[PDB]
Amino acid sequence: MSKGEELFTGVVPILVELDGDVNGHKFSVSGEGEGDATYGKLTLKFICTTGKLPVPWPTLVTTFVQCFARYPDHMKQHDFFKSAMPEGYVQERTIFFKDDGNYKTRAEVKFEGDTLVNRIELKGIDFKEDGNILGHKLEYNYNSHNVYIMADKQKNGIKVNFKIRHNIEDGSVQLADHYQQNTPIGDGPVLLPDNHYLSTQSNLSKDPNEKRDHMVLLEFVTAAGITGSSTMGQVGRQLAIIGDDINRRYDSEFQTMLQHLQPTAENAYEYFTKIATSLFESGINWGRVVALLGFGYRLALHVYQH
Amino acid sequence: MSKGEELFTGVVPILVELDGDVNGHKFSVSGEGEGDATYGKLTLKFICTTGKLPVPWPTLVTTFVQCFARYPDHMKQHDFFKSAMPEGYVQERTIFFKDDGNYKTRAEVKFEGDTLVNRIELKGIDFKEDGNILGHKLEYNYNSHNVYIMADKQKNGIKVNFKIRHNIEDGSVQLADHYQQNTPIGDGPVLLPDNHYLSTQSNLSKDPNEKRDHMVLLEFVTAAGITGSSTMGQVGRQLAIIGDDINRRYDSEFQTMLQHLQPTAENAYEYFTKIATSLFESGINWGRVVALLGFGYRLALHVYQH
Ligand SMILES: C[As](C)(=O)[O-]
């Protein structure tokens, strides 16, 4: 584990600032909320302080603080985001919108007193005015995605990528390919993770009281893709219980089958093939494949002996 | 072996009587010939003693003495038919002609002096008037079939079934599904067999000197299915019955194991290795190796497809 992990034991208040320029359109956004890393829960409201948002709100969702992800106990040595605190880290992204323009972003995430703050710059270029983005054709919703993470040892951080699918109004999808890197601000030791991912569920809503153009954003974030030793041990013990049952119930049967069949080494493969064929001609399912496997095994045991 | 087995060491003379009713048409048939169980050979001539046979001769072939089957030496303890002699046995059949009527038959087969006699009653119902049986559309020939035999421990006899394929003159086929049971008449000890079959070749011809409506029937009958390659069909059927149990009993558990384990393609082999290690730490036997293979198989399916 790390020391920064300790800053996230409770609910942490969050502030966000963003300056944006997409195809020459400028805009600013301010955000507030709270993060609860213990339960991988994130609550945010954003207001555009410069008028109407010039791009659809959903395209800013990935841009609008992965240090709040819930890491299971067996994966806590892979939480780079919290290990880099409180000094913080820099988050850089390039987002390619298929058949359209791209965003580039730079963001500083660090503590300021008790508050986690995220200052962001965004420059978008090459967007078609008829396109999904500037044409405002995206639906006000969000799908779940996996955020895949790798260590970037030469840069003392992590490399990240994922592919967002934005629902479009006619029923189609607009892809946004995210390439991301996160670099520590402090000179202290951070944690480099094994490959894993963040599983992310997001929800977009409105504040009925809010006069400005805005977005209410709720996110659930959980680390996964690494399975602990306890689960592997557990599956192993299940298989053993199952294997002992299979053995007690069927071993002598498979043995007498081979006794009657009297295979030699020269006819084993042939016998096996023909047997597999009349078994499977009434159908194939998982258990039948397993019976054929146990038969194959006993067949090999049988020819190997003698 | 048995004592009744010794009644068949040489050539045995055969008499057959049949009284029949199909859809109200009555008729009688008398038959004579010889059986030589030593070489699995059977030679019979039948005369309709009431005029023209109201049904095609091929449909009566199976009804017209399996104690003449050649049982190979390594299988003679599986010969229920001969173990029941001379006291004899009762053979009952229901024969379903697909898309047509059925035959019901009862037959007593026993020695009387030096002669093996077979007395039979046959009743057919629900036969279509223009159909293949009453329309006399079967060809005068016969295919080879296997007669599948299993013990019937509560009835102290055997259960038997098979499916005959009758060639029809227009080029189609008429299936005749046989269900059969054999019950000892005497109180002597009979042989109850393991599962096996009789391979039956038949030929139908005429006597050029016979003016009455008649059939000459030659049959070759040999038992197999106990040892060697002839066991392959049964082993497949066993595996299918077993595979289906394994599937009913464990398919869902293996699925919930893989879902919880969340293997990726990149960690699949490692997870598998670790799983194998905690399984085998309590021991190895055949059933445990089978369970591991079953897990491995479903695992390769899960990752290879995603
Ligand atoms: C499962 As199949 C099409 O080989 O009977």
Coordinates of C-alpha atoms and ligand atoms in Angstrom, one line a residue:
Chain A
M1 CA 0.0 0.0 0.0
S2 CA 0.9 3.7 0.3
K3 CA 0.5 6.9 2.4
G4 CA -1.7 8.7 0.0
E5 CA -4.3 5.9 0.3
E6 CA -5.0 7.4 3.8
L7 CA -6.2 10.7 2.4
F8 CA -9.2 8.9 0.8
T9 CA -10.5 6.9 3.8
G10 CA -13.3 9.4 4.1
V11 CA -15.5 11.7 1.9
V12 CA -13.3 14.2 0.1
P13 CA -14.7 17.4 -1.4
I14 CA -13.8 18.0 -5.0
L15 CA -13.5 21.2 -7.1
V16 CA -13.0 21.4 -10.8
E17 CA -12.1 24.0 -13.3
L18 CA -11.9 23.7 -17.1
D19 CA -11.0 26.0 -20.0
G20 CA -12.0 24.8 -23.4
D21 CA -11.5 25.7 -27.0
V22 CA -13.0 23.5 -29.6
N23 CA -12.6 24.7 -33.2
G24 CA -12.1 28.2 -31.9
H25 CA -15.2 28.2 -29.5
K26 CA -14.1 29.1 -26.0
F27 CA -16.0 28.1 -22.9
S28 CA -15.5 27.5 -19.2
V29 CA -16.9 25.0 -16.7
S30 CA -16.8 24.9 -12.9
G31 CA -17.6 21.8 -11.0
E32 CA -18.1 20.7 -7.4
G33 CA -18.8 17.5 -5.6
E34 CA -17.5 14.8 -3.3
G35 CA -15.7 11.5 -3.7
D36 CA -15.9 8.4 -1.5
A37 CA -13.1 6.1 -2.5
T38 CA -14.1 3.5 0.1
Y39 CA -17.2 2.8 -1.9
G40 CA -15.8 3.8 -5.4
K41 CA -18.5 6.5 -5.6
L42 CA -18.3 9.9 -7.3
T43 CA -20.8 12.8 -7.2
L44 CA -20.4 15.9 -9.4
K45 CA -22.2 18.9 -10.8
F46 CA -20.8 21.1 -13.5
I47 CA -22.0 24.5 -14.7
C48 CA -20.9 26.3 -17.9
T49 CA -20.1 29.8 -16.8
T50 CA -19.7 31.3 -20.3
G51 CA -23.1 30.5 -21.8
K52 CA -24.3 27.5 -23.7
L53 CA -22.0 24.6 -23.9
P54 CA -20.7 24.5 -27.5
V55 CA -20.2 20.7 -27.5
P56 CA -22.4 17.9 -26.1
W57 CA -22.0 17.3 -22.3
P58 CA -21.3 13.5 -22.7
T59 CA -18.1 14.2 -24.7
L60 CA -16.7 15.9 -21.5
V61 CA -17.7 13.1 -19.1
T62 CA -14.4 11.2 -19.3
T63 CA -12.6 14.6 -18.9
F64 CA -14.7 15.6 -15.9
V65 CA -10.8 11.8 -11.0
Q66 CA -9.7 8.2 -10.9
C67 CA -8.1 8.5 -7.5
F68 CA -11.6 7.9 -6.2
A69 CA -11.8 4.3 -7.6
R70 CA -12.5 1.5 -5.1
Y71 CA -9.5 -0.8 -5.1
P72 CA -10.2 -4.2 -3.5
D73 CA -7.8 -5.2 -0.7
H74 CA -5.9 -7.7 -2.9
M75 CA -5.2 -5.0 -5.5
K76 CA -4.3 -2.1 -3.3
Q77 CA -0.7 -2.3 -4.3
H78 CA -1.8 -1.3 -7.8
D79 CA -3.5 2.1 -6.9
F80 CA -1.1 4.6 -8.6
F81 CA -3.6 7.4 -8.4
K82 CA -3.8 7.5 -4.6
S83 CA 0.0 6.8 -4.1
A84 CA 0.8 10.0 -6.0
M85 CA -1.1 12.1 -3.5
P86 CA -1.1 14.6 -2.1
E87 CA 1.4 16.2 -4.5
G88 CA -0.8 14.9 -7.3
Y89 CA -0.3 13.8 -10.9
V90 CA -0.7 15.2 -14.4
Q91 CA -3.3 13.6 -16.7
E92 CA -2.9 14.0 -20.4
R93 CA -5.3 12.6 -23.0
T94 CA -5.8 12.6 -26.7
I95 CA -9.3 11.6 -27.7
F96 CA -10.0 10.6 -31.4
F97 CA -13.6 10.9 -32.5
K98 CA -14.0 8.5 -35.3
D99 CA -14.7 10.3 -38.6
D100 CA -14.4 13.6 -36.7
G101 CA -12.1 15.8 -34.7
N102 CA -10.1 15.2 -31.6
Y103 CA -9.7 16.6 -28.0
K104 CA -6.3 17.0 -26.3
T105 CA -6.4 17.7 -22.5
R106 CA -4.0 18.4 -19.8
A107 CA -5.1 18.2 -16.1
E108 CA -3.5 18.7 -12.8
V109 CA -4.9 16.6 -9.9
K110 CA -3.6 17.4 -6.5
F111 CA -4.8 18.3 -3.0
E112 CA -5.2 21.9 -1.8
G113 CA -5.9 21.7 1.8
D114 CA -8.6 19.1 2.4
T115 CA -10.0 19.5 -1.2
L116 CA -9.2 17.5 -4.3
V117 CA -8.9 19.8 -7.2
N118 CA -8.8 19.2 -10.9
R119 CA -7.6 22.0 -13.3
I120 CA -8.1 21.2 -16.9
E121 CA -7.3 22.6 -20.3
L122 CA -9.0 21.3 -23.4
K123 CA -8.3 22.1 -27.1
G124 CA -10.5 20.4 -29.7
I125 CA -9.6 20.6 -33.4
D126 CA -10.8 19.4 -36.8
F127 CA -14.5 18.8 -36.0
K128 CA -17.0 18.6 -38.7
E129 CA -19.7 21.3 -38.3
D130 CA -22.2 18.7 -39.5
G131 CA -20.6 16.1 -37.3
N132 CA -22.0 14.3 -34.2
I133 CA -20.2 16.6 -31.9
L134 CA -20.7 20.1 -33.2
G135 CA -24.0 18.9 -34.7
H136 CA -25.1 18.0 -31.2
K137 CA -26.4 14.5 -32.1
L138 CA -25.3 12.6 -29.0
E139 CA -27.9 11.3 -26.5
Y140 CA -27.8 12.5 -22.9
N141 CA -26.7 9.2 -21.4
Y142 CA -23.6 7.0 -20.9
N143 CA -22.6 3.4 -21.3
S144 CA -20.3 1.4 -19.0
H145 CA -16.7 1.0 -20.0
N146 CA -13.5 -0.6 -18.9
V147 CA -10.5 1.6 -18.5
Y148 CA -7.4 -0.5 -19.1
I149 CA -4.3 0.4 -17.2
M150 CA -0.6 -0.5 -17.6
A151 CA 2.6 0.6 -15.8
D152 CA 4.8 3.1 -17.7
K153 CA 8.1 2.5 -15.9
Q154 CA 10.2 4.8 -18.0
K155 CA 7.9 7.7 -17.3
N156 CA 7.3 6.7 -13.6
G157 CA 3.5 6.6 -14.2
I158 CA 0.9 4.7 -16.1
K159 CA -0.4 4.4 -19.6
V160 CA -4.1 4.1 -20.1
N161 CA -6.5 3.5 -22.9
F162 CA -10.2 2.7 -23.6
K163 CA -12.8 3.2 -26.2
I164 CA -16.0 5.1 -25.3
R165 CA -19.2 4.4 -27.2
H166 CA -21.6 7.4 -27.4
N167 CA -25.2 6.7 -28.3
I168 CA -26.3 8.7 -31.2
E169 CA -30.0 9.7 -31.7
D170 CA -30.7 7.6 -34.8
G171 CA -29.6 4.4 -33.1
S172 CA -26.0 4.4 -34.3
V173 CA -22.8 4.9 -32.2
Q174 CA -20.0 7.5 -32.2
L175 CA -16.7 6.1 -31.0
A176 CA -14.1 8.1 -29.0
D177 CA -10.7 6.4 -28.6
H178 CA -8.9 7.6 -25.5
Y179 CA -5.2 7.6 -25.1
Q180 CA -4.1 8.8 -21.7
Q181 CA -1.0 9.1 -19.5
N182 CA -0.7 10.0 -15.9
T183 CA 2.5 11.4 -14.5
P184 CA 3.3 12.0 -10.8
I185 CA 3.9 15.6 -9.6
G186 CA 5.8 14.8 -6.5
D187 CA 9.3 13.2 -6.4
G188 CA 8.1 10.7 -3.8
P189 CA 7.7 7.0 -4.6
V190 CA 4.5 6.1 -6.4
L191 CA 3.1 2.6 -7.0
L192 CA 3.4 1.0 -10.5
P193 CA 0.5 -1.4 -11.1
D194 CA 0.3 -4.7 -12.9
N195 CA -2.1 -4.6 -15.8
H196 CA -5.7 -4.1 -14.6
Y197 CA -8.8 -2.0 -15.4
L198 CA -11.3 0.4 -13.8
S199 CA -14.9 -0.7 -14.3
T200 CA -17.0 2.4 -14.6
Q201 CA -20.7 3.1 -14.5
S202 CA -21.8 6.6 -15.2
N203 CA -25.1 8.5 -15.0
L204 CA -26.0 11.9 -16.4
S205 CA -28.9 13.9 -15.0
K206 CA -30.1 17.5 -14.5
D207 CA -30.6 19.8 -11.5
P208 CA -34.2 21.0 -11.6
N209 CA -33.2 24.3 -9.9
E210 CA -30.2 25.2 -12.1
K211 CA -30.5 28.1 -14.5
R212 CA -27.2 27.7 -16.2
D213 CA -26.3 25.0 -18.8
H214 CA -25.1 22.1 -16.7
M215 CA -24.6 18.4 -16.0
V216 CA -25.1 16.3 -12.9
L217 CA -22.7 13.4 -13.1
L218 CA -22.7 10.2 -10.9
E219 CA -20.0 7.6 -11.3
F220 CA -19.3 4.2 -9.7
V221 CA -15.7 3.1 -10.1
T222 CA -14.2 -0.2 -9.2
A223 CA -10.8 -1.7 -9.9
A224 CA -10.7 -5.2 -11.4
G225 CA -9.0 -7.6 -13.8
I226 CA -6.7 -9.1 -11.3
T227 CA -8.1 -12.0 -9.3
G228 CA -6.9 -12.7 -5.8
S229 CA -5.2 -15.8 -4.4
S230 CA -8.2 -16.4 -2.2
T231 CA -10.4 -16.9 -5.2
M232 CA -8.1 -19.2 -7.0
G233 CA -7.7 -21.3 -3.9
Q234 CA -11.5 -21.4 -3.5
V235 CA -12.0 -22.5 -7.1
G236 CA -9.3 -25.2 -6.6
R237 CA -11.0 -26.5 -3.5
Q238 CA -14.4 -26.7 -5.4
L239 CA -12.8 -28.6 -8.2
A240 CA -11.4 -31.0 -5.7
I241 CA -14.8 -31.6 -4.2
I242 CA -16.2 -32.1 -7.6
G243 CA -13.3 -34.2 -8.8
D244 CA -13.6 -36.6 -5.8
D245 CA -17.4 -37.0 -6.6
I246 CA -16.8 -37.6 -10.2
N247 CA -14.1 -40.1 -9.3
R248 CA -16.2 -42.0 -6.7
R249 CA -19.2 -42.2 -9.1
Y250 CA -17.5 -43.0 -12.4
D251 CA -13.9 -44.2 -12.1
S252 CA -14.6 -47.9 -12.1
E253 CA -17.1 -47.4 -15.0
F254 CA -14.5 -45.8 -17.2
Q255 CA -12.1 -48.5 -16.2
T256 CA -14.4 -51.4 -17.1
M257 CA -15.2 -49.6 -20.4
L258 CA -11.5 -49.7 -21.3
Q259 CA -11.2 -53.3 -20.0
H260 CA -13.8 -54.4 -22.5
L261 CA -12.5 -52.3 -25.3
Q262 CA -9.0 -53.7 -25.1
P263 CA -7.2 -50.9 -27.0
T264 CA -3.6 -51.1 -28.1
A265 CA -1.2 -48.2 -28.8
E266 CA -1.8 -48.7 -32.5
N267 CA -5.5 -48.4 -32.5
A268 CA -6.1 -45.9 -29.6
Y269 CA -6.4 -42.7 -31.6
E270 CA -8.7 -44.5 -34.0
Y271 CA -10.9 -45.9 -31.3
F272 CA -11.1 -42.5 -29.6
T273 CA -12.1 -40.7 -32.8
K274 CA -14.9 -43.2 -33.7
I275 CA -16.1 -43.1 -30.1
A276 CA -16.2 -39.3 -30.1
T277 CA -18.2 -39.4 -33.4
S278 CA -21.1 -41.5 -32.2
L279 CA -21.2 -39.7 -28.9
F280 CA -21.5 -36.4 -30.5
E281 CA -24.0 -37.4 -33.2
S282 CA -26.8 -37.1 -30.7
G283 CA -25.4 -33.6 -29.7
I284 CA -22.7 -31.8 -27.9
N285 CA -22.7 -30.2 -24.5
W286 CA -20.1 -29.3 -21.9
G287 CA -20.6 -32.4 -19.8
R288 CA -20.3 -34.7 -22.8
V289 CA -17.1 -33.1 -23.8
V290 CA -15.9 -33.7 -20.2
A291 CA -16.9 -37.4 -20.4
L292 CA -15.0 -37.8 -23.6
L293 CA -12.1 -36.1 -21.9
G294 CA -12.1 -38.4 -18.9
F295 CA -12.4 -41.3 -21.3
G296 CA -9.5 -40.0 -23.4
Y297 CA -7.4 -39.8 -20.2
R298 CA -8.3 -43.2 -19.0
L299 CA -7.6 -44.5 -22.5
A300 CA -4.1 -43.0 -22.3
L301 CA -3.5 -44.4 -18.8
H302 CA -4.6 -47.8 -20.1
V303 CA -2.2 -47.9 -23.1
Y304 CA 0.6 -46.3 -21.0
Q305 CA 0.3 -49.2 -18.6
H306 CA 0.8 -52.7 -20.0
Chain B
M1 CA -22.4 -71.2 -19.6
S2 CA -25.6 -73.3 -19.0
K3 CA -27.1 -76.8 -19.4
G4 CA -29.7 -75.8 -22.0
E5 CA -26.7 -74.7 -24.1
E6 CA -26.0 -78.4 -24.8
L7 CA -29.4 -78.9 -26.5
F8 CA -28.0 -76.8 -29.4
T9 CA -24.6 -78.4 -30.1
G10 CA -25.9 -80.0 -33.3
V11 CA -28.6 -79.4 -35.9
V12 CA -32.1 -78.9 -34.4
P13 CA -35.4 -79.3 -36.2
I14 CA -37.9 -76.4 -36.0
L15 CA -41.7 -76.1 -36.1
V16 CA -43.6 -72.8 -36.1
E17 CA -47.3 -72.0 -35.9
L18 CA -48.8 -68.6 -36.2
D19 CA -52.4 -67.4 -35.9
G20 CA -53.0 -63.9 -37.1
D21 CA -55.4 -61.0 -37.4
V22 CA -54.7 -57.7 -39.1
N23 CA -57.5 -55.3 -39.3
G24 CA -59.9 -58.2 -39.2
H25 CA -58.3 -60.3 -41.9
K26 CA -57.6 -63.8 -40.4
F27 CA -54.9 -66.1 -41.6
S28 CA -52.7 -69.1 -40.7
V29 CA -49.0 -69.9 -41.3
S30 CA -47.1 -73.1 -40.7
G31 CA -43.3 -73.3 -40.8
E32 CA -40.6 -75.9 -40.6
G33 CA -36.8 -75.9 -40.9
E34 CA -33.6 -76.2 -38.9
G35 CA -31.3 -74.1 -36.8
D36 CA -27.6 -74.7 -36.2
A37 CA -26.5 -72.5 -33.3
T38 CA -22.9 -73.6 -33.7
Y39 CA -22.6 -71.6 -36.9
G40 CA -25.5 -69.1 -36.2
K41 CA -27.5 -70.4 -39.1
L42 CA -31.3 -70.7 -39.5
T43 CA -33.2 -72.3 -42.4
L44 CA -37.0 -72.0 -42.6
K45 CA -39.9 -72.4 -45.1
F46 CA -43.3 -71.0 -44.3
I47 CA -46.7 -71.7 -45.9
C48 CA -49.8 -69.6 -45.6
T49 CA -52.5 -72.4 -45.0
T50 CA -55.5 -70.1 -45.5
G51 CA -54.8 -68.6 -49.0
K52 CA -53.0 -65.4 -49.9
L53 CA -51.2 -63.7 -47.0
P54 CA -53.2 -60.5 -46.3
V55 CA -50.0 -58.7 -45.3
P56 CA -46.5 -58.7 -47.0
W57 CA -44.2 -61.5 -46.1
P58 CA -41.3 -59.2 -45.1
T59 CA -43.4 -57.8 -42.2
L60 CA -43.5 -61.2 -40.6
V61 CA -39.8 -62.0 -40.9
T62 CA -38.8 -60.9 -37.4
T63 CA -41.8 -62.8 -35.9
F64 CA -40.9 -66.0 -37.6
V65 CA -36.0 -68.1 -32.8
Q66 CA -32.9 -66.4 -31.3
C67 CA -31.7 -69.4 -29.3
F68 CA -30.0 -70.3 -32.6
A69 CA -27.7 -67.2 -32.4
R70 CA -24.0 -68.0 -32.4
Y71 CA -22.6 -66.7 -29.1
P72 CA -18.8 -66.6 -29.3
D73 CA -17.0 -68.6 -26.6
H74 CA -16.1 -65.5 -24.5
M75 CA -19.8 -64.5 -24.4
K76 CA -21.6 -67.7 -23.7
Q77 CA -22.6 -66.6 -20.2
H78 CA -24.7 -63.9 -21.9
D79 CA -26.9 -66.3 -23.8
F80 CA -30.3 -66.0 -22.0
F81 CA -32.2 -67.7 -24.9
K82 CA -30.4 -71.1 -24.6
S83 CA -30.2 -70.9 -20.8
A84 CA -34.0 -71.0 -20.7
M85 CA -34.2 -74.3 -22.6
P86 CA -35.9 -76.9 -22.7
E87 CA -38.5 -75.3 -20.5
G88 CA -38.5 -72.4 -23.0
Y89 CA -39.4 -68.8 -22.9
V90 CA -42.2 -66.4 -23.8
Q91 CA -41.4 -63.7 -26.3
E92 CA -43.7 -60.6 -26.5
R93 CA -43.5 -57.8 -29.1
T94 CA -45.2 -54.7 -30.0
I95 CA -44.2 -53.6 -33.5
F96 CA -45.0 -50.0 -34.6
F97 CA -45.1 -49.3 -38.3
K98 CA -44.3 -45.6 -38.7
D99 CA -47.4 -43.8 -39.9
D100 CA -49.4 -47.0 -39.9
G101 CA -50.7 -49.7 -37.6
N102 CA -48.9 -52.0 -35.2
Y103 CA -48.5 -55.7 -34.6
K104 CA -48.8 -57.3 -31.2
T105 CA -47.4 -60.8 -30.8
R106 CA -47.1 -63.5 -28.2
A107 CA -44.9 -66.6 -28.7
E108 CA -43.9 -69.6 -26.7
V109 CA -40.6 -71.2 -27.7
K110 CA -39.7 -74.6 -26.2
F111 CA -38.5 -78.0 -27.0
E112 CA -41.0 -80.8 -27.5
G113 CA -38.9 -84.0 -27.8
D114 CA -36.1 -83.3 -30.3
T115 CA -38.0 -80.5 -31.9
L116 CA -37.9 -76.8 -31.1
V117 CA -41.4 -75.4 -31.5
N118 CA -42.6 -71.8 -31.7
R119 CA -46.4 -71.1 -31.3
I120 CA -47.5 -67.6 -32.1
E121 CA -50.5 -65.3 -32.0
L122 CA -50.4 -61.9 -33.9
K123 CA -52.9 -59.0 -33.8
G124 CA -52.6 -55.9 -35.9
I125 CA -54.7 -52.8 -35.6
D126 CA -55.1 -49.3 -37.0
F127 CA -53.5 -50.1 -40.4
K128 CA -54.2 -47.7 -43.3
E129 CA -56.0 -49.5 -46.2
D130 CA -53.9 -48.0 -49.0
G131 CA -50.8 -47.9 -46.9
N132 CA -47.6 -49.9 -47.4
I133 CA -48.6 -52.9 -45.3
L134 CA -52.2 -53.5 -46.5
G135 CA -51.4 -52.0 -50.0
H136 CA -48.6 -54.6 -50.4
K137 CA -45.9 -52.2 -51.4
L138 CA -42.9 -53.6 -49.6
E139 CA -40.1 -55.1 -51.7
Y140 CA -39.4 -58.9 -51.2
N141 CA -36.0 -58.4 -49.5
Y142 CA -34.5 -57.6 -46.2
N143 CA -31.7 -55.5 -44.6
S144 CA -29.2 -56.3 -41.9
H145 CA -30.0 -55.1 -38.4
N146 CA -28.6 -55.2 -34.9
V147 CA -30.8 -56.6 -32.1
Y148 CA -30.0 -54.8 -28.8
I149 CA -30.3 -56.8 -25.6
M150 CA -30.3 -55.9 -22.0
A151 CA -31.1 -57.7 -18.8
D152 CA -34.5 -57.2 -17.2
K153 CA -33.7 -58.3 -13.6
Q154 CA -37.3 -57.9 -12.1
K155 CA -38.9 -60.0 -14.9
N156 CA -36.0 -62.5 -14.7
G157 CA -35.7 -62.1 -18.5
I158 CA -34.5 -59.7 -21.1
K159 CA -35.7 -56.5 -22.8
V160 CA -34.9 -56.1 -26.5
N161 CA -35.5 -53.5 -29.2
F162 CA -34.4 -52.6 -32.7
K163 CA -35.7 -50.8 -35.8
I164 CA -36.3 -52.6 -39.1
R165 CA -36.0 -50.7 -42.4
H166 CA -38.3 -52.2 -45.0
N167 CA -37.6 -51.1 -48.7
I168 CA -40.6 -49.8 -50.5
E169 CA -41.2 -50.3 -54.2
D170 CA -41.6 -46.5 -54.9
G171 CA -38.1 -45.9 -53.4
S172 CA -39.1 -44.9 -49.9
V173 CA -38.6 -46.7 -46.6
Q174 CA -41.0 -48.1 -44.0
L175 CA -39.7 -48.2 -40.5
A176 CA -40.9 -50.9 -38.1
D177 CA -40.0 -50.3 -34.5
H178 CA -39.8 -53.4 -32.4
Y179 CA -40.2 -53.6 -28.6
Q180 CA -39.7 -57.0 -27.2
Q181 CA -39.4 -58.9 -23.9
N182 CA -38.5 -62.4 -23.1
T183 CA -39.6 -64.3 -20.0
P184 CA -38.5 -67.8 -18.9
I185 CA -41.2 -70.4 -18.5
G186 CA -39.4 -72.7 -16.1
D187 CA -38.2 -72.1 -12.6
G188 CA -34.6 -73.1 -13.4
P189 CA -31.8 -70.5 -13.1
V190 CA -31.4 -68.4 -16.3
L191 CA -28.5 -66.3 -17.5
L192 CA -29.1 -62.5 -17.3
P193 CA -26.8 -60.8 -19.8
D194 CA -24.8 -57.6 -19.8
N195 CA -25.7 -55.3 -22.7
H196 CA -24.9 -56.7 -26.1
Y197 CA -26.5 -57.3 -29.5
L198 CA -27.2 -59.9 -32.2
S199 CA -26.2 -59.2 -35.7
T200 CA -28.8 -60.5 -38.1
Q201 CA -28.5 -61.1 -41.9
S202 CA -31.5 -62.3 -43.7
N203 CA -32.5 -63.5 -47.1
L204 CA -36.0 -64.1 -48.5
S205 CA -36.6 -66.4 -51.5
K206 CA -39.1 -68.8 -53.0
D207 CA -39.2 -72.5 -53.6
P208 CA -39.7 -73.1 -57.3
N209 CA -41.8 -76.2 -56.6
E210 CA -44.2 -74.6 -54.1
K211 CA -47.5 -73.5 -55.5
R212 CA -48.9 -72.1 -52.2
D213 CA -48.2 -68.6 -51.0
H214 CA -45.0 -69.0 -49.1
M215 CA -41.6 -67.7 -48.0
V216 CA -38.2 -69.2 -47.7
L217 CA -36.1 -67.5 -45.0
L218 CA -32.4 -67.9 -44.3
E219 CA -30.8 -66.1 -41.4
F220 CA -27.3 -65.6 -40.1
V221 CA -27.3 -64.5 -36.5
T222 CA -24.2 -63.6 -34.4
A223 CA -23.8 -62.1 -31.0
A224 CA -21.3 -59.2 -30.3
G225 CA -21.0 -56.1 -28.1
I226 CA -19.2 -57.5 -25.1
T227 CA -15.5 -57.2 -25.8
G228 CA -13.4 -55.5 -28.5
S229 CA -14.3 -53.0 -31.2
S230 CA -17.9 -54.2 -31.3
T231 CA -18.4 -52.4 -27.9
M232 CA -17.8 -49.0 -29.4
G233 CA -21.4 -48.1 -30.0
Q234 CA -22.4 -48.9 -26.4
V235 CA -19.5 -46.9 -25.0
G236 CA -20.6 -43.9 -26.9
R237 CA -24.1 -44.3 -25.6
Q238 CA -22.7 -44.7 -22.0
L239 CA -20.6 -41.6 -22.5
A240 CA -23.6 -39.6 -23.8
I241 CA -25.8 -40.8 -20.8
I242 CA -22.9 -39.9 -18.4
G243 CA -22.0 -36.6 -20.1
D244 CA -25.6 -35.5 -19.8
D245 CA -25.5 -36.2 -16.0
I246 CA -22.3 -34.3 -15.6
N247 CA -23.9 -31.4 -17.5
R248 CA -27.1 -31.3 -15.4
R249 CA -25.1 -31.7 -12.2
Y250 CA -22.2 -29.3 -12.8
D251 CA -22.5 -27.0 -15.8
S252 CA -24.0 -24.1 -13.8
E253 CA -21.2 -24.4 -11.2
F254 CA -18.4 -24.3 -13.7
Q255 CA -20.1 -21.2 -15.3
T256 CA -20.3 -19.4 -12.0
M257 CA -16.7 -20.3 -11.3
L258 CA -15.5 -18.8 -14.5
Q259 CA -17.6 -15.7 -14.2
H260 CA -16.3 -14.9 -10.7
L261 CA -12.7 -15.7 -11.8
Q262 CA -12.9 -13.1 -14.7
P263 CA -10.0 -14.5 -16.6
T264 CA -8.5 -12.4 -19.4
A265 CA -6.9 -14.0 -22.4
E266 CA -3.5 -12.8 -21.0
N267 CA -3.8 -14.4 -17.6
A268 CA -5.8 -17.4 -18.5
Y269 CA -2.8 -19.8 -18.5
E270 CA -1.5 -18.4 -15.2
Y271 CA -4.9 -18.6 -13.5
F272 CA -5.2 -22.2 -14.7
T273 CA -1.8 -23.2 -13.4
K274 CA -2.5 -21.7 -9.9
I275 CA -5.9 -23.4 -9.8
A276 CA -4.4 -26.7 -10.7
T277 CA -1.9 -26.3 -7.9
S278 CA -4.5 -25.7 -5.1
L279 CA -6.6 -28.6 -6.5
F280 CA -3.7 -31.1 -6.4
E281 CA -2.4 -30.0 -3.0
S282 CA -5.1 -32.3 -1.5
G283 CA -4.3 -35.1 -3.9
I284 CA -4.6 -36.4 -7.5
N285 CA -6.9 -39.0 -8.9
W286 CA -8.7 -39.6 -12.2
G287 CA -11.9 -37.6 -11.3
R288 CA -9.8 -34.7 -10.1
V289 CA -7.9 -34.7 -13.4
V290 CA -11.2 -34.8 -15.2
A291 CA -12.6 -31.9 -13.3
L292 CA -9.5 -29.9 -14.1
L293 CA -9.8 -30.6 -17.8
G294 CA -13.5 -29.7 -17.7
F295 CA -12.5 -26.3 -16.2
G296 CA -9.7 -25.9 -18.7
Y297 CA -12.0 -26.6 -21.6
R298 CA -14.7 -24.1 -20.5
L299 CA -11.9 -21.7 -19.7
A300 CA -10.5 -21.9 -23.3
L301 CA -14.0 -21.4 -24.6
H302 CA -14.6 -18.3 -22.5
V303 CA -11.3 -16.6 -23.6
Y304 CA -11.1 -17.9 -27.2
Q305 CA -14.5 -16.4 -27.8
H306 CA -13.9 -13.0 -26.1
Ligands
LIG1 C1 -23.7 -31.6 -32.4 AS1 -23.9 -32.5 -34.2 C2 -24.4 -31.2 -35.5 O1 -22.3 -33.2 -34.6 O2 -25.0 -33.8 -34.0

